[PDB]
């Protein structure tokens, strides 16, 4: 028995990340139709993206970037952020075996293998399997997820470039601290840091597969897949940047 209290922050970035992490949302009987499932996922996704925008505003340094940089970073990274968190829930709740969109919206093996679900679900689940393989910790995850917010930028650079690089490097160092805290030796630390940064680089490829579905299902109105306002606005604005080759993926490695 303990009194109520808020957890004790410490003067470290990961401690703040832990307090600002949004709570997992509930979607609020799963359909037997790919078409209906996709619309439902999008409605949940719009709510998750609003929560992520609020989270980003609290990340140390983010709000000091030019407003245009902030908007651009969220437009370019939203999918990566959503897929990474979906990967984490699927890893923690199902060992990477089921897609855990929300505690009340789990997509089982049968539904993941419906004709029009098979391909997208294989790509949506892949990152979860990697988190499981690497046994990523919560602190490592929180640092990596922040790095994803800071991983997709305009080819011509941001308006607040210097500040952005500084902020991004604080989180790269923070990831190092999360690994070091495991108490492995120097060689193991180097190896793990290389593996986790390789995983971050691999998110760009998974996301390309998923944005291809997102953009096509959004654009072809005749397909009757619905998107909430938040997502529709973002996607509408993101497509021209993506298709013009303006989204540059920061990679740690060659790749």
């Amino acid at each position: 028995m303990v009194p109520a209290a808020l957890p004790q922050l410490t003067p470290t970035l990961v401690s703040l990340l832990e307090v600002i992490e949004p709570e997992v949302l509930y979607a609020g009987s799963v359909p037997d139709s790919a078409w209906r499932i996709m619309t439902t996922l999008n409605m949940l996704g719009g709510r998750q993206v609003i929560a992520a925008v609020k989270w980003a505003k609290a990340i140390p340094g983010f709000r000091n970037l030019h407003l245009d940089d902030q908007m651009t970073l969220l437009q370019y990274s939203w999918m990566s952020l959503m897929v990474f968190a979906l990967g984490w829930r699927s890893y923690r709740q199902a060992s990477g075996n089921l897609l855990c969109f929300a505690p009340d919206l789990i997509i089982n093996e049968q539904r993941m293998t419906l004709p029009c679900m098979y391909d997208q679900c294989k790509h949506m689940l892949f990152i979860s399997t990697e988190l499981q393989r690497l046994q990523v910790s919560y602190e490592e995850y929180l640092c990596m997820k922040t790095l994803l917010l800071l991983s997709s930028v305009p080819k011509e650079g941001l308006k607040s470039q210097e500040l952005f690089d500084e902020i991004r490097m604080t989180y790269i160092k923070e990831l190092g601290k999360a690994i070091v805290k495991r108490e492995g030796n120097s060689s193991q630390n180097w190896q793990r840091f290389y593996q986790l940064t390789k995983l971050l680089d691999s998110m760009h490829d998974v996301v390309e597969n998923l944005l291809s579905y997102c953009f096509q299902t959004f654009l072809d109105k005749s397909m009757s897949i619905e998107f909430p306002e938040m997502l529709a606005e973002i996607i509408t604005n993101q497509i021209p940047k993506y298709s013009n080759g303006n989204i540059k993926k920061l990679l740690f490695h060659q790749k």
Binding site: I50, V53, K54, L67, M71, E229, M230, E233
Partner: peptide, 10 residues
């Protein structure tokens, strides 16, 4: 063009 996102950020 980016009303909802801009509003949220403001």
């Amino acid at each position: 063009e980016n009303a909802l996102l801009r509003y949220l950020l403001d």
